[PDB]
Coordinates of N, CA and C in Angstrom, one line a residue:
Chain A
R1 N 0.4 -1.3 -24.4 CA -0.6 -0.9 -23.3 C -1.2 -2.2 -22.6
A2 N -0.3 -3.0 -22.0 CA -0.7 -4.1 -21.1 C -1.6 -3.6 -19.9
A3 N -2.1 -4.6 -19.2 CA -2.8 -4.3 -17.9 C -1.8 -3.9 -16.8
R4 N -2.1 -3.0 -16.0 CA -1.2 -2.7 -14.8 C -1.2 -3.8 -13.8
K5 N 0.0 -4.0 -13.2 CA 0.3 -5.0 -12.2 C 0.6 -4.3 -10.8
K6 N 0.5 -5.0 -9.8 CA 0.6 -4.3 -8.5 C 2.1 -4.1 -8.0
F7 N 3.0 -4.9 -8.5 CA 4.4 -4.8 -8.0 C 5.3 -4.6 -9.2
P8 N 6.5 -4.0 -9.0 CA 7.4 -3.9 -10.1 C 7.8 -5.3 -10.6
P9 N 8.3 -5.3 -11.9 CA 8.5 -6.6 -12.5 C 9.7 -7.3 -11.9
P10 N 9.5 -8.7 -11.9 CA 10.6 -9.5 -11.4 C 11.7 -9.7 -12.4
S11 N 12.9 -10.0 -12.0 CA 14.0 -10.4 -12.9 C 13.9 -11.8 -13.3
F12 N 14.4 -12.1 -14.5 CA 14.6 -13.5 -14.9 C 15.6 -14.2 -14.1
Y13 N 16.5 -13.5 -13.4 CA 17.6 -14.1 -12.7 C 17.7 -13.8 -11.2
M14 N 18.3 -14.8 -10.5 CA 18.7 -14.5 -9.1 C 19.5 -13.3 -9.0
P15 N 19.5 -12.6 -7.9 CA 20.4 -11.4 -7.7 C 21.8 -11.8 -7.5
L16 N 22.7 -10.8 -7.6 CA 24.1 -10.9 -7.0 C 24.1 -10.1 -5.7
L17 N 25.0 -10.5 -4.8 CA 25.3 -9.8 -3.6 C 26.6 -9.0 -3.8
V18 N 26.6 -7.7 -3.4 CA 27.8 -6.9 -3.5 C 28.4 -6.7 -2.1
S19 N 29.5 -7.6 -1.8 CA 30.2 -7.6 -0.6 C 31.2 -6.5 -0.4
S20 N 30.8 -5.3 -0.3 CA 31.5 -4.2 0.5 C 30.8 -3.0 0.1
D21 N 31.5 -1.8 0.1 CA 32.8 -1.2 0.5 C 33.0 -0.3 -0.8
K22 N 32.9 -0.9 -1.9 CA 33.0 -0.2 -3.2 C 31.5 -0.2 -3.7
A23 N 31.3 0.9 -4.4 CA 30.0 1.1 -5.1 C 29.8 0.0 -6.1
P24 N 28.5 -0.5 -6.2 CA 28.1 -1.4 -7.3 C 28.6 -0.9 -8.7
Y25 N 28.4 0.4 -9.0 CA 28.9 0.9 -10.3 C 30.3 0.7 -10.6
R26 N 31.1 0.6 -9.5 CA 32.6 0.4 -9.6 C 32.9 -1.1 -9.9
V27 N 32.2 -2.0 -9.2 CA 32.6 -3.3 -9.3 C 32.0 -4.2 -10.3
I28 N 30.9 -3.8 -10.9 CA 30.2 -4.6 -11.9 C 30.9 -4.3 -13.2
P29 N 31.5 -5.3 -13.9 CA 32.1 -5.1 -15.2 C 31.1 -4.6 -16.2
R30 N 31.7 -3.8 -17.2 CA 30.9 -3.3 -18.3 C 30.1 -4.2 -19.0
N31 N 30.5 -5.5 -19.1 CA 29.9 -6.5 -20.0 C 29.3 -7.7 -19.1
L32 N 28.9 -7.4 -17.9 CA 28.3 -8.5 -17.0 C 26.9 -8.7 -17.3
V33 N 26.6 -9.4 -18.4 CA 25.3 -9.7 -18.9 C 25.0 -11.2 -18.7
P34 N 24.0 -11.6 -18.0 CA 23.7 -13.1 -17.9 C 23.5 -13.7 -19.2
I35 N 23.9 -14.9 -19.4 CA 23.8 -15.7 -20.6 C 22.5 -16.5 -20.7
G36 N 21.9 -16.6 -21.9 CA 20.9 -17.6 -22.2 C 19.5 -17.1 -22.7
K37 N 19.3 -15.8 -23.0 CA 18.1 -15.3 -23.5 C 18.4 -14.3 -24.6
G38 N 17.6 -14.2 -25.6 CA 17.7 -13.1 -26.6 C 18.7 -13.4 -27.7
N39 N 18.6 -12.6 -28.7 CA 19.6 -12.6 -29.7 C 20.8 -11.8 -29.4
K40 N 21.8 -11.8 -30.3 CA 23.0 -11.1 -30.0 C 22.8 -9.6 -29.8
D41 N 21.9 -9.0 -30.4 CA 21.7 -7.6 -30.3 C 21.0 -7.2 -29.0
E42 N 20.5 -8.2 -28.3 CA 19.7 -8.0 -27.0 C 20.6 -8.3 -25.8
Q43 N 21.9 -8.5 -25.8 CA 22.7 -8.8 -24.6 C 23.2 -7.5 -24.0
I44 N 22.2 -6.8 -23.4 CA 22.3 -5.4 -22.9 C 21.2 -5.1 -21.9
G45 N 21.6 -4.4 -20.8 CA 20.6 -4.1 -19.8 C 21.2 -3.4 -18.7
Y46 N 20.6 -3.6 -17.5 CA 21.1 -2.9 -16.3 C 21.0 -3.8 -15.1
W47 N 21.8 -3.5 -14.1 CA 21.6 -4.1 -12.7 C 21.1 -3.0 -11.8
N48 N 20.0 -3.3 -11.1 CA 19.3 -2.4 -10.3 C 19.7 -2.7 -8.8
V49 N 20.2 -1.7 -8.1 CA 20.6 -1.9 -6.7 C 19.4 -1.8 -5.8
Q50 N 19.4 -2.8 -4.9 CA 18.5 -2.9 -3.7 C 19.3 -2.7 -2.4
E51 N 19.1 -1.6 -1.8 CA 19.7 -1.3 -0.4 C 19.0 -2.3 0.6
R52 N 19.8 -2.8 1.5 CA 19.3 -3.8 2.4 C 19.7 -3.6 3.9
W53 N 18.8 -3.6 4.8 CA 19.1 -3.4 6.3 C 18.2 -4.2 7.1
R54 N 18.5 -4.5 8.3 CA 17.5 -5.1 9.1 C 17.8 -4.6 10.6
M55 N 16.7 -4.8 11.4 CA 16.8 -4.7 12.8 C 17.1 -6.0 13.5
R56 N 18.2 -6.0 14.3 CA 18.5 -7.1 15.3 C 18.8 -6.4 16.6
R57 N 17.9 -6.6 17.6 CA 17.9 -5.8 18.8 C 17.5 -4.3 18.5
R58 N 19.6 -1.2 13.8 CA 19.7 -1.2 12.4 C 21.0 -1.7 11.9
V59 N 21.0 -2.9 11.2 CA 22.2 -3.4 10.7 C 22.1 -3.2 9.1
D60 N 23.1 -2.5 8.5 CA 23.2 -2.4 7.1 C 23.8 -3.7 6.5
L61 N 23.2 -4.2 5.5 CA 23.6 -5.4 4.8 C 24.1 -5.1 3.4
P62 N 25.0 -6.1 2.9 CA 25.4 -5.9 1.5 C 24.2 -5.7 0.6
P63 N 24.3 -4.8 -0.3 CA 23.2 -4.6 -1.3 C 23.1 -5.8 -2.2
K64 N 21.9 -6.0 -2.8 CA 21.7 -6.9 -3.9 C 21.5 -6.1 -5.1
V65 N 21.9 -6.7 -6.2 CA 21.6 -6.2 -7.6 C 20.8 -7.2 -8.4
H66 N 19.8 -6.8 -9.2 CA 19.0 -7.6 -10.0 C 19.1 -7.2 -11.5
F67 N 19.2 -8.1 -12.4 CA 19.5 -7.7 -13.8 C 18.2 -7.7 -14.6
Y68 N 18.1 -6.7 -15.5 CA 17.0 -6.6 -16.4 C 17.5 -6.2 -17.7
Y69 N 16.9 -6.8 -18.8 CA 17.3 -6.4 -20.1 C 16.8 -4.9 -20.4
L70 N 17.5 -4.3 -21.3 CA 17.2 -3.0 -21.8 C 15.7 -2.9 -22.2
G71 N 15.0 -1.9 -21.7 CA 13.6 -1.7 -22.0 C 12.6 -2.6 -21.3
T72 N 13.1 -3.2 -20.2 CA 12.3 -4.1 -19.3 C 12.6 -3.7 -17.9
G73 N 11.8 -4.3 -17.0 CA 12.1 -4.1 -15.6 C 11.5 -2.8 -15.0
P74 N 11.9 -2.5 -13.8 CA 11.5 -1.2 -13.1 C 11.9 0.0 -13.8
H75 N 13.0 0.0 -14.6 CA 13.5 1.1 -15.3 C 13.4 0.9 -16.8
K76 N 12.2 0.3 -17.3 CA 11.9 0.1 -18.7 C 12.0 1.3 -19.5
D77 N 11.8 2.5 -18.9 CA 11.7 3.8 -19.5 C 13.0 4.4 -19.9
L78 N 14.1 3.9 -19.2 CA 15.4 4.5 -19.4 C 16.1 4.0 -20.6
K79 N 16.7 5.0 -21.3 CA 17.6 4.6 -22.5 C 18.9 4.2 -21.9
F80 N 19.6 3.5 -22.8 CA 20.9 2.9 -22.3 C 21.8 3.9 -21.8
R81 N 22.2 3.8 -20.6 CA 23.1 4.6 -19.9 C 22.6 5.9 -19.4
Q82 N 21.3 6.1 -19.5 CA 20.6 7.2 -18.8 C 20.9 7.2 -17.4
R83 N 21.4 8.3 -16.8 CA 21.9 8.3 -15.4 C 20.8 8.1 -14.4
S84 N 20.8 7.1 -13.5 CA 19.9 7.0 -12.4 C 20.7 6.3 -11.3
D85 N 20.7 6.9 -10.1 CA 21.5 6.4 -9.0 C 21.0 5.0 -8.7
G86 N 21.9 4.0 -8.6 CA 21.6 2.6 -8.3 C 21.3 1.8 -9.5
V87 N 21.5 2.4 -10.7 CA 21.3 1.7 -11.9 C 22.7 1.6 -12.6
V88 N 23.1 0.3 -12.8 CA 24.4 0.0 -13.4 C 24.3 -0.6 -14.7
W89 N 24.8 0.0 -15.8 CA 24.6 -0.5 -17.1 C 25.6 -1.5 -17.7
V90 N 25.1 -2.4 -18.4 CA 26.0 -3.5 -19.0 C 25.6 -3.8 -20.4
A91 N 26.6 -4.2 -21.2 CA 26.4 -4.7 -22.6 C 27.5 -5.5 -23.0
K92 N 27.2 -6.5 -23.8 CA 28.3 -7.2 -24.5 C 28.5 -6.7 -25.9
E93 N 29.6 -7.0 -26.5 CA 30.0 -6.7 -27.8 C 28.9 -7.3 -28.8
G94 N 28.5 -6.5 -29.7 CA 27.4 -6.9 -30.6 C 26.0 -6.5 -30.3
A95 N 25.8 -6.0 -29.0 CA 24.5 -5.6 -28.6 C 24.1 -4.3 -29.4
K96 N 22.8 -4.0 -29.5 CA 22.4 -2.7 -29.9 C 21.7 -2.0 -28.9
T97 N 21.8 -0.7 -28.9 CA 21.2 0.1 -27.8 C 19.8 0.5 -28.0
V98 N 18.9 -0.5 -28.2 CA 17.5 -0.4 -28.4 C 16.8 -1.4 -27.4
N99 N 15.6 -1.1 -27.1 CA 14.8 -1.9 -26.2 C 14.7 -3.3 -26.7
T100 N 14.9 -4.2 -25.9 CA 14.8 -5.7 -26.2 C 13.4 -6.1 -26.2
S101 N 13.2 -7.4 -26.8 CA 11.9 -8.0 -26.9 C 11.5 -8.9 -25.8
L102 N 12.3 -8.9 -24.8 CA 12.3 -10.0 -23.8 C 11.3 -9.9 -22.7
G103 N 10.7 -8.8 -22.5 CA 9.8 -8.6 -21.4 C 10.4 -8.9 -20.0
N104 N 9.5 -9.3 -19.1 CA 9.8 -9.6 -17.8 C 9.4 -11.1 -17.4
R105 N 10.0 -11.5 -16.3 CA 9.7 -12.8 -15.8 C 8.3 -12.8 -15.3
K106 N 7.6 -14.0 -15.5 CA 6.3 -14.2 -14.8 C 6.6 -14.5 -13.4
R107 N 5.7 -13.9 -12.5 CA 6.0 -14.0 -11.1 C 6.1 -15.4 -10.6
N108 N 5.3 -16.3 -11.1 CA 5.4 -17.7 -10.6 C 6.4 -18.6 -11.3
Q109 N 7.2 -18.0 -12.3 CA 8.4 -18.6 -13.0 C 9.5 -18.5 -11.9
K110 N 10.3 -19.6 -11.6 CA 11.4 -19.4 -10.7 C 12.6 -18.6 -11.5
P111 N 13.2 -17.7 -10.7 CA 14.4 -17.1 -11.3 C 15.5 -18.1 -11.6
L112 N 16.3 -17.8 -12.6 CA 17.5 -18.6 -13.0 C 18.7 -18.1 -12.3
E113 N 19.7 -19.0 -12.0 CA 21.0 -18.6 -11.6 C 21.7 -18.0 -12.8
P114 N 22.2 -16.7 -12.7 CA 22.9 -16.1 -13.8 C 24.3 -16.7 -14.1
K115 N 24.6 -17.0 -15.3 CA 25.9 -17.5 -15.7 C 26.5 -16.4 -16.6
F116 N 27.8 -16.3 -16.6 CA 28.6 -15.3 -17.3 C 29.7 -15.9 -18.1
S117 N 30.2 -15.1 -19.1 CA 31.4 -15.3 -19.9 C 32.6 -14.8 -19.3
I118 N 32.6 -14.1 -18.2 CA 33.7 -13.6 -17.5 C 33.7 -14.1 -16.1
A119 N 34.8 -14.0 -15.4 CA 34.9 -14.2 -13.9 C 34.1 -13.1 -13.2
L120 N 33.4 -13.5 -12.1 CA 32.9 -12.5 -11.2 C 34.1 -11.9 -10.5
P121 N 34.1 -10.6 -10.4 CA 35.0 -9.9 -9.5 C 34.8 -10.4 -8.0
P122 N 35.9 -10.2 -7.2 CA 35.8 -10.7 -5.8 C 34.6 -10.2 -5.0
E123 N 34.1 -9.0 -5.3 CA 33.1 -8.4 -4.5 C 31.6 -8.8 -4.9
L124 N 31.5 -9.6 -5.9 CA 30.2 -10.1 -6.4 C 30.1 -11.6 -6.2
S125 N 28.9 -12.0 -5.7 CA 28.5 -13.5 -5.6 C 27.1 -13.7 -5.9
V126 N 26.8 -14.9 -6.4 CA 25.4 -15.2 -6.7 C 24.7 -15.5 -5.4
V127 N 23.5 -15.0 -5.3 CA 22.6 -15.4 -4.2 C 21.9 -16.7 -4.7
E128 N 22.2 -17.8 -4.0 CA 21.6 -19.1 -4.4 C 20.2 -19.3 -3.9
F129 N 19.4 -20.1 -4.6 CA 18.1 -20.8 -4.1 C 16.9 -20.3 -4.9
Chain B
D1 N 22.8 20.9 -11.4 CA 24.1 20.3 -11.9 C 23.7 19.2 -13.0
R2 N 24.7 18.3 -13.2 CA 24.5 16.9 -13.5 C 25.4 16.2 -12.5
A3 N 24.8 16.1 -11.3 CA 25.5 15.6 -10.1 C 26.3 14.3 -10.2
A4 N 27.4 14.2 -9.4 CA 28.2 12.9 -9.3 C 27.2 11.8 -9.0
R5 N 27.5 10.6 -9.6 CA 26.7 9.4 -9.3 C 27.0 8.9 -7.9
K6 N 25.9 8.4 -7.3 CA 25.8 7.8 -6.0 C 25.5 6.3 -6.1
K7 N 25.9 5.6 -5.1 CA 25.8 4.2 -5.2 C 24.5 3.5 -5.0
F8 N 23.5 4.2 -4.4 CA 22.2 3.6 -4.0 C 21.2 4.6 -4.6
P9 N 20.0 4.0 -4.8 CA 18.9 4.9 -5.3 C 18.5 5.9 -4.2
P10 N 17.9 7.0 -4.6 CA 17.7 8.0 -3.6 C 16.7 7.7 -2.6
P11 N 17.0 8.2 -1.3 CA 16.0 8.0 -0.3 C 14.9 9.0 -0.3
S12 N 13.7 8.6 0.2 CA 12.5 9.4 0.3 C 12.7 10.4 1.5
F13 N 12.1 11.5 1.4 CA 12.0 12.5 2.5 C 11.1 11.9 3.6
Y14 N 10.3 10.9 3.3 CA 9.3 10.5 4.3 C 9.4 9.0 4.7
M15 N 9.0 8.6 5.9 CA 8.8 7.3 6.2 C 7.8 6.6 5.2
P16 N 7.9 5.3 5.0 CA 7.0 4.6 4.1 C 5.6 4.4 4.8
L17 N 4.7 4.0 3.9 CA 3.4 3.5 4.4 C 3.5 2.0 4.2
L18 N 2.7 1.2 4.9 CA 2.5 -0.2 4.8 C 1.1 -0.4 4.1
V19 N 1.1 -1.3 3.2 CA -0.2 -1.7 2.5 C -0.6 -3.0 3.0
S20 N -1.6 -3.1 3.9 CA -2.1 -4.3 4.5 C -3.3 -4.8 3.6
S21 N -4.1 -5.7 4.2 CA -5.1 -6.4 3.3 C -4.7 -6.9 1.9
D22 N -5.6 -7.2 1.0 CA -5.3 -7.9 -0.3 C -5.0 -7.0 -1.5
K23 N -5.7 -5.9 -1.5 CA -5.8 -5.0 -2.7 C -4.5 -4.4 -3.2
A24 N -4.4 -4.2 -4.4 CA -3.2 -3.5 -5.0 C -3.0 -2.1 -4.5
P25 N -1.8 -1.7 -4.3 CA -1.5 -0.4 -3.9 C -2.1 0.7 -4.8
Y26 N -2.1 0.4 -6.1 CA -2.7 1.4 -7.0 C -4.2 1.6 -6.8
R27 N -4.9 0.6 -6.2 CA -6.3 0.7 -5.9 C -6.6 1.4 -4.6
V28 N -5.7 1.3 -3.6 CA -6.0 1.8 -2.3 C -5.5 3.2 -2.0
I29 N -4.4 3.6 -2.8 CA -3.8 4.9 -2.5 C -4.6 6.0 -3.2
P30 N -5.2 6.9 -2.4 CA -6.1 8.0 -3.1 C -5.3 8.8 -4.0
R31 N -6.0 9.4 -5.1 CA -5.4 10.2 -6.1 C -4.6 11.3 -5.6
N32 N -4.9 11.9 -4.4 CA -4.4 13.0 -3.9 C -3.6 12.8 -2.6
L33 N -3.0 11.6 -2.4 CA -2.3 11.3 -1.1 C -0.9 11.8 -1.3
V34 N -0.7 13.1 -1.1 CA 0.6 13.8 -1.1 C 1.0 14.2 0.3
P35 N 2.1 13.8 0.8 CA 2.6 14.3 2.1 C 2.6 15.8 2.1
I36 N 2.3 16.4 3.3 CA 2.4 17.8 3.5 C 3.7 18.3 4.0
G37 N 4.1 19.5 3.6 CA 5.2 20.3 4.2 C 6.4 20.7 3.5
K38 N 6.5 20.4 2.1 CA 7.6 20.8 1.3 C 7.0 21.3 0.0
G39 N 7.7 22.3 -0.5 CA 7.4 22.8 -1.9 C 6.3 23.8 -1.9
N40 N 6.2 24.4 -3.1 CA 5.1 25.3 -3.3 C 3.8 24.6 -3.8
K41 N 2.7 25.3 -4.1 CA 1.5 24.7 -4.4 C 1.6 23.9 -5.7
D42 N 2.4 24.3 -6.6 CA 2.5 23.6 -7.9 C 3.3 22.3 -7.8
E43 N 4.0 22.1 -6.7 CA 4.9 21.0 -6.5 C 4.3 19.9 -5.7
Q44 N 3.0 19.9 -5.3 CA 2.4 18.9 -4.5 C 1.9 17.7 -5.4
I45 N 2.9 17.0 -5.9 CA 2.6 16.0 -7.0 C 3.9 15.0 -6.9
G46 N 3.6 13.7 -7.2 CA 4.6 12.8 -7.3 C 4.1 11.4 -7.3
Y47 N 4.9 10.5 -6.8 CA 4.5 9.1 -6.8 C 4.9 8.3 -5.5
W48 N 4.1 7.2 -5.3 CA 4.5 6.2 -4.3 C 5.1 5.0 -5.1
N49 N 6.3 4.6 -4.6 CA 7.0 3.5 -5.3 C 6.8 2.2 -4.4
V50 N 6.3 1.2 -4.9 CA 6.1 -0.1 -4.2 C 7.4 -0.9 -4.0
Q51 N 7.6 -1.3 -2.8 CA 8.7 -2.2 -2.4 C 8.0 -3.6 -2.0
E52 N 8.2 -4.6 -2.7 CA 7.7 -6.0 -2.4 C 8.6 -6.5 -1.3
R53 N 8.1 -7.2 -0.3 CA 8.7 -7.6 1.0 C 8.4 -9.1 1.3
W54 N 9.5 -9.9 1.5 CA 9.3 -11.3 1.9 C 10.5 -11.7 2.6
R55 N 10.3 -12.6 3.6 CA 11.4 -13.1 4.3 C 11.3 -14.7 4.4
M56 N 12.4 -15.3 4.7 CA 12.4 -16.7 5.1 C 12.3 -16.8 6.6
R57 N 11.4 -17.7 7.0 CA 11.3 -18.2 8.4 C 11.1 -19.7 8.3
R58 N 12.1 -20.5 8.6 CA 12.3 -21.9 8.3 C 12.7 -22.1 6.8
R59 N 9.4 -19.2 3.2 CA 9.2 -17.8 2.6 C 7.9 -17.2 2.9
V60 N 7.9 -16.1 3.6 CA 6.7 -15.5 4.1 C 6.7 -14.1 3.3
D61 N 5.6 -14.0 2.5 CA 5.4 -12.7 1.9 C 4.8 -11.7 2.9
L62 N 5.3 -10.5 2.9 CA 4.9 -9.5 3.9 C 4.1 -8.4 3.1
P63 N 3.4 -7.6 3.9 CA 2.7 -6.4 3.2 C 3.8 -5.6 2.6
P64 N 3.5 -5.1 1.4 CA 4.4 -4.2 0.7 C 4.5 -2.9 1.4
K65 N 5.7 -2.2 1.2 CA 5.8 -0.8 1.6 C 5.8 0.1 0.4
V66 N 5.3 1.3 0.6 CA 5.4 2.3 -0.4 C 6.1 3.5 0.1
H67 N 7.0 4.1 -0.8 CA 7.7 5.3 -0.4 C 7.4 6.5 -1.4
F68 N 7.2 7.7 -0.9 CA 6.8 8.8 -1.7 C 8.0 9.6 -2.2
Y69 N 7.9 10.0 -3.4 CA 8.9 10.9 -4.1 C 8.1 11.9 -4.9
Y70 N 8.6 13.2 -4.8 CA 8.1 14.2 -5.7 C 8.4 14.0 -7.1
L71 N 7.5 14.5 -8.0 CA 7.7 14.4 -9.4 C 9.1 14.9 -9.8
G72 N 9.8 14.1 -10.7 CA 11.1 14.5 -11.1 C 12.2 14.2 -10.1
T73 N 11.9 13.4 -9.1 CA 12.9 13.0 -8.1 C 12.8 11.6 -7.9
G74 N 13.7 11.0 -7.0 CA 13.6 9.6 -6.6 C 14.1 8.6 -7.7
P75 N 13.8 7.3 -7.5 CA 14.3 6.3 -8.4 C 13.7 6.4 -9.7
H76 N 12.5 7.0 -9.9 CA 11.8 7.2 -11.2 C 11.8 8.7 -11.5
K77 N 12.9 9.4 -11.4 CA 13.0 10.8 -11.7 C 12.7 11.1 -13.1
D78 N 12.9 10.1 -14.0 CA 12.8 10.1 -15.4 C 11.4 10.1 -16.0
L79 N 10.5 9.6 -15.1 CA 9.1 9.4 -15.5 C 8.3 10.7 -15.5
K80 N 7.6 10.9 -16.6 CA 6.6 12.0 -16.7 C 5.4 11.6 -15.8
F81 N 4.6 12.6 -15.4 CA 3.5 12.3 -14.5 C 2.6 11.3 -15.1
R82 N 2.3 10.2 -14.5 CA 1.4 9.2 -14.8 C 1.9 8.3 -15.9
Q83 N 3.1 8.4 -16.3 CA 3.8 7.4 -17.2 C 3.7 6.0 -16.5
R84 N 3.2 5.0 -17.3 CA 2.9 3.8 -16.6 C 4.1 3.0 -16.3
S85 N 4.3 2.5 -15.0 CA 5.3 1.7 -14.6 C 4.8 0.8 -13.5
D86 N 4.9 -0.5 -13.5 CA 4.2 -1.3 -12.5 C 4.9 -1.0 -11.2
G87 N 4.1 -0.9 -10.1 CA 4.6 -0.5 -8.8 C 4.7 0.9 -8.6
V88 N 4.4 1.8 -9.5 CA 4.5 3.2 -9.4 C 3.0 3.8 -9.3
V89 N 2.7 4.4 -8.2 CA 1.3 4.9 -8.0 C 1.3 6.4 -8.0
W90 N 0.6 7.1 -8.8 CA 0.7 8.6 -9.0 C -0.3 9.4 -8.1
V91 N 0.2 10.5 -7.6 CA -0.6 11.3 -6.7 C -0.4 12.7 -7.0
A92 N -1.5 13.6 -6.9 CA -1.3 15.0 -7.0 C -2.5 15.7 -6.3
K93 N -2.2 16.8 -5.7 CA -3.3 17.7 -5.2 C -3.7 18.7 -6.1
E94 N -4.9 19.3 -5.9 CA -5.4 20.4 -6.7 C -4.5 21.5 -6.6
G95 N -4.2 22.1 -7.8 CA -3.2 23.2 -7.9 C -1.8 22.8 -8.3
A96 N -1.5 21.5 -8.3 CA -0.2 21.1 -8.7 C 0.0 21.3 -10.2
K97 N 1.2 21.4 -10.7 CA 1.5 21.4 -12.1 C 2.3 20.1 -12.4
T98 N 2.1 19.6 -13.6 CA 2.6 18.3 -14.1 C 4.0 18.6 -14.6
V99 N 4.9 19.2 -13.9 CA 6.3 19.4 -14.2 C 7.2 19.0 -13.1
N100 N 8.4 18.7 -13.4 CA 9.4 18.2 -12.4 C 9.5 19.3 -11.4
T101 N 9.5 18.8 -10.1 CA 9.7 19.7 -9.0 C 11.2 20.1 -8.7
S102 N 11.4 21.0 -7.8 CA 12.7 21.6 -7.5 C 13.3 20.9 -6.3
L103 N 12.6 19.9 -5.7 CA 12.8 19.5 -4.3 C 14.0 18.5 -4.2
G104 N 14.4 17.8 -5.2 CA 15.5 16.9 -5.1 C 15.1 15.7 -4.2
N105 N 16.1 15.1 -3.6 CA 16.0 14.0 -2.7 C 16.6 14.2 -1.3
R106 N 16.1 13.4 -0.4 CA 16.6 13.5 1.0 C 18.1 13.1 1.0
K107 N 18.9 13.9 1.9 CA 20.2 13.4 2.2 C 20.2 12.1 3.0
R108 N 21.1 11.2 2.7 CA 21.0 9.9 3.4 C 21.1 10.0 4.9
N109 N 21.9 10.9 5.4 CA 22.0 11.1 6.9 C 21.0 11.9 7.5
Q110 N 20.0 12.5 6.8 CA 18.8 13.2 7.3 C 17.8 12.2 7.7
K111 N 17.1 12.3 8.8 CA 16.1 11.3 9.1 C 14.8 11.5 8.3
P112 N 14.2 10.5 7.8 CA 12.9 10.6 7.2 C 11.8 11.2 8.1
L113 N 10.9 11.9 7.5 CA 9.8 12.5 8.3 C 8.6 11.6 8.3
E114 N 7.8 11.6 9.3 CA 6.5 10.9 9.3 C 5.6 11.7 8.4
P115 N 5.0 11.1 7.3 CA 4.1 11.9 6.4 C 2.8 12.2 7.0
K116 N 2.4 13.4 6.9 CA 1.0 13.8 7.3 C 0.2 14.2 6.1
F117 N -1.1 14.0 6.2 CA -2.0 14.2 5.0 C -3.2 15.1 5.4
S118 N -3.8 15.6 4.3 CA -5.1 16.4 4.4 C -6.3 15.6 4.3
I119 N -6.2 14.3 4.1 CA -7.2 13.3 4.0 C -7.0 12.2 5.0
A120 N -8.0 11.4 5.3 CA -7.9 10.2 6.1 C -7.1 9.2 5.3
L121 N -6.3 8.4 6.0 CA -5.8 7.2 5.3 C -6.8 6.2 5.2
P122 N -7.0 5.6 4.1 CA -7.8 4.4 3.9 C -7.4 3.3 4.9
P123 N -8.3 2.3 5.1 CA -8.1 1.3 6.2 C -6.9 0.4 5.8
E124 N -6.5 0.3 4.6 CA -5.4 -0.6 4.1 C -4.0 0.0 4.2
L125 N -4.0 1.3 4.6 CA -2.7 2.0 4.7 C -2.4 2.5 6.1
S126 N -1.1 2.3 6.5 CA -0.7 2.8 7.8 C 0.7 3.3 7.7
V127 N 1.1 4.3 8.6 CA 2.4 4.7 8.6 C 3.3 3.8 9.3
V128 N 4.5 3.6 8.7 CA 5.6 2.8 9.4 C 6.3 3.9 10.3
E129 N 6.2 3.6 11.6 CA 6.8 4.6 12.6 C 8.3 4.2 12.8
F130 N 9.1 5.3 13.0 CA 10.4 5.4 13.8 C 11.6 5.2 12.9

């Protein structure tokens, strides 16, 4: 029972961009978990889709996805693989399907560029900066 | 059903509000700020979901937007009424019941409606038009 904050929690990582066409749930591999936090049983979570559009003179833009460990983030309440549109689940071998201890990024902490053990598929790219 | 999965989170039936000034959305949005015109009396309950907004010009933080969803619908369809989640602001009118509503979500190709209320909007809230 922490104090309530005004905005949903930030990701530890920079987002990926989904360049097309195919659904994020289609293109993000089962085991696309960023490397470098938690123990082996904590390499599990989800990518949350952000739909993106802008006015120039409505232009639909590639969506972004942001990664959160299981039991953290905007969908901290969801059990592993509980169905929610725009939520894409990932886990590596050895993970356990329980809430992790990792919390959320502090707002003034810069996000990290996510690195992986697998190649990114062609439709996924890291958003730099 | 247990409907086929969709690629994006569900859209709101309504246009968003904009939260100007300094205060947190949870502070400014009244307890009973439920848009009018769908559902029965027991369904006038749900939440406003905060969208943080910032762009680059040459990073400019913008006023956040909030989008309304009936209880048991939207990106937080899984949450019980008033289950704590940062950026989720709960609302209900008198007579509502704290159970999932029957209303679902807007179809993507249906245009959002401008939300109308039984109460004045506080000074920090305005409708995003069009």
